[PDB]
């Protein structure tokens with residue numbers, strides 16, 4: 012098309028608001044204050060191609076998975092309205108996170124102001140992913156006891172809202188604060204260790220590891236700590252500058268870790284429900 016033609020550019024030519032990873036040396040999209048060109052650029056090769064498509068493709072996937080769940084027969088659930096509301100909040104959190112992300116990774120190169128607004132929606136989406144993922148997990152983990160279930164819900168929501176308020180600070184988006192983000196969100200998700208200690212302290216290592224939770228929760232902490240480590244350390248683009256530029260750089264692998272992470276997490280709480288059903292609502 013002879014409308015909105017652009018070329019990829021090296022890092023040095025990017026304005027300071029687009030310059031974020033000095034290991035992605037070429038393949039950058041230039042500032043294009045046209046969302047027409049921005050959304051058309053989804054069908055182009057560049058540093059954000061994979062970022063766009065992993066969370067764009069992953070967003071339609073959670074959208075389908077969250078629609079199909081809503082239309083599940085109500086005999087499957089002990090309390091289908093309640094049980095569907097808890098999963099619903101996880102699914103919305105998963106959908107919003109991926110949407111804010113693929114939208115931001117798309118309209119990113121548009122302007123400084125636009126990238127500034129959508130990056131704050133992008134960060135905020137991570138916090139809503141963690142918050143929402145806790146809701147069905149606490150519903151089944153603290154099923155027969157609601158004093159911790161209520162407290163831990165407020166704890167994850169008070170922490171998540173703080174993370175979301177800290178995401179509005181413009182320093183938080185700078186590449187000097189990259190480690191601070193990987194710690195802020197990593198801390199948010201790892202704070203689940205509080206209710207894990209508490210659950211284990213009252214059910215015991217038998218009632219906790221027999222029911223898969225311990226084996227699953229560890230893999231989840233692996234995905235969380237390995238994943239955040241990649242983002243903050245910029246691996247592998249640190250070891251192969253200008254070679255891992257279009258495919259397989261850290262932000263791209265991190266997207267895969269987020270979609271995979273939210274799938275492992277869904278399959279986990281979709282087991283706590285398959286189990287709570289095989290036992291009914293007894294206390």
Ligand SMILES: C[C@@H](O)CN1CCN(CC(=O)O)CCN(CC(=O)O)CCN(CC(=O)O)CC1
Pocket residue numbers: none
């Ligand atoms: C003559 C080349 O310098 C032109 N070529 C540059 C890229 N490489 C090599 C390089 O990086 O210099 C050539 C390989 N090429 C097609 C093929 O190999 O058949 C892929 C498409 N590219 C995209 C682009 O760069 O805009 C078209 C322009």
Ligand SMILES: C[C@@H](O)CN1CCN(CC(=O)O)CCN(CC(=O)O)CCN(CC(=O)O)CC1
Pocket residue numbers: 019037038056256257
């Ligand atoms: C300049 C861009 O318009 C090229 N662009 C499309 C065509 N290429 C070329 C190929 O087919 O070999 C595909 C693979 N390519 C290798 C390479 O070109 O170095 C990746 C890196 N290039 C950066 C660069 O070209 O300097 C970005 C991709």
Ligand SMILES: C[C@@H](O)CN1CCN(CC(=O)O)CCN(CC(=O)O)CCN(CC(=O)O)CC1
Pocket residue numbers: 026027028123124
């Ligand atoms: C001043 C800097 O420390 C912070 N600033 C970036 C400055 N750029 C400079 C450039 O990169 O050319 C100007 C672009 N523009 C504003 C304008 O129209 O002057 C966007 C809004 N600004 C507001 C401001 O200018 O303070 C946001 C942050």
Ligand SMILES: CCCCCCCC/C=C/CCCCCCCC(=O)OC[C@@H](O)CO
Pocket residue numbers: 044045046047048050110114
């Ligand atoms: C959660 C998903 C939400 C939907 C995301 C968007 C999907 C559809 C995308 C549409 C892109 C259409 C192009 C939008 C083009 C408008 C911007 C533009 O360049 O305007 C120029 C002038 O009007 C001003 O100078």
Ligand SMILES: CCCCCCCC/C=C/CCCCCCCC(=O)OC[C@@H](O)CO
Pocket residue numbers: 068071072075076078079080082083084
């Ligand atoms: C559209 C409403 C359908 C209602 C079905 C009612 C029965 C309950 C359904 C349970 C889940 C069935 C398996 C479907 C599980 C979701 C997978 C999905 O949709 O992935 C999206 C990708 O294929 C595309 O990117």
Ligand SMILES: CCCCCCCC/C=C\CCCCCCCC(=O)OC[C@@H](O)CO
Pocket residue numbers: 074077078081082083084085086099100102103
């Ligand atoms: C889908 C994204 C996740 C966030 C929630 C979105 C809000 C959904 C709002 C309204 C949906 C109205 C219809 C809701 C339909 C759910 C009940 C249903 O059909 O169960 C199958 C049973 O009939 C079998 O016994």
Ligand SMILES: CCCCCCCC/C=C\CCCCCCCC(=O)OC[C@@H](O)CO
Pocket residue numbers: 081085091092095096099100103
């Ligand atoms: C922010 C997201 C919150 C969740 C929104 C979606 C909630 C799910 C919607 C409807 C579930 C209704 C379950 C109600 C089950 C009642 C029993 C019945 O008679 O079932 C017949 C069914 O066909 C009725 O659905």
Ligand SMILES: CCCCCCCC/C=C\CCCCCCCC(=O)OC[C@@H](O)CO
Pocket residue numbers: 093096097100101103104139142143146149150153154155157160164168
């Ligand atoms: C983006 C999403 C962010 C997280 C939103 C958090 C909202 C929390 C509020 C309500 C969650 C659904 C509660 C649904 C109502 C629960 C009532 C109940 O009987 O609870 C006892 C159970 O624990 C065991 O049976």
Ligand SMILES: CCCCCCCC/C=C\CCCCCCCC(=O)OC[C@@H](O)CO
Pocket residue numbers: 141144145148200201202203204207211216220225228229231232276
């Ligand atoms: C996005 C949600 C991800 C999952 C939910 C929250 C994640 C919580 C974070 C970390 C929990 C990791 C648990 C790792 C295991 C700790 C429990 C423990 O001490 O078990 C004793 C047994 O090993 C004895 O055999």
Ligand SMILES: CCCCCCCC/C=C\CCCCCCCC(=O)O
Pocket residue numbers: 133134137140144192193194196197200234235236238239242265268269270271272273276
């Ligand atoms: C959902 C289950 C876990 C999935 C993997 C999560 C990885 C660890 C979480 C946070 C650390 C990375 C912080 C990224 C902040 C900037 C957001 C971005 O643009 O990607």
Ligand SMILES: [Gd]
Pocket residue numbers: none
């Ligand atoms: Gd400015």
Ligand SMILES: [Zn+2]
Pocket residue numbers: 062112116262266
């Ligand atoms: Zn991202």
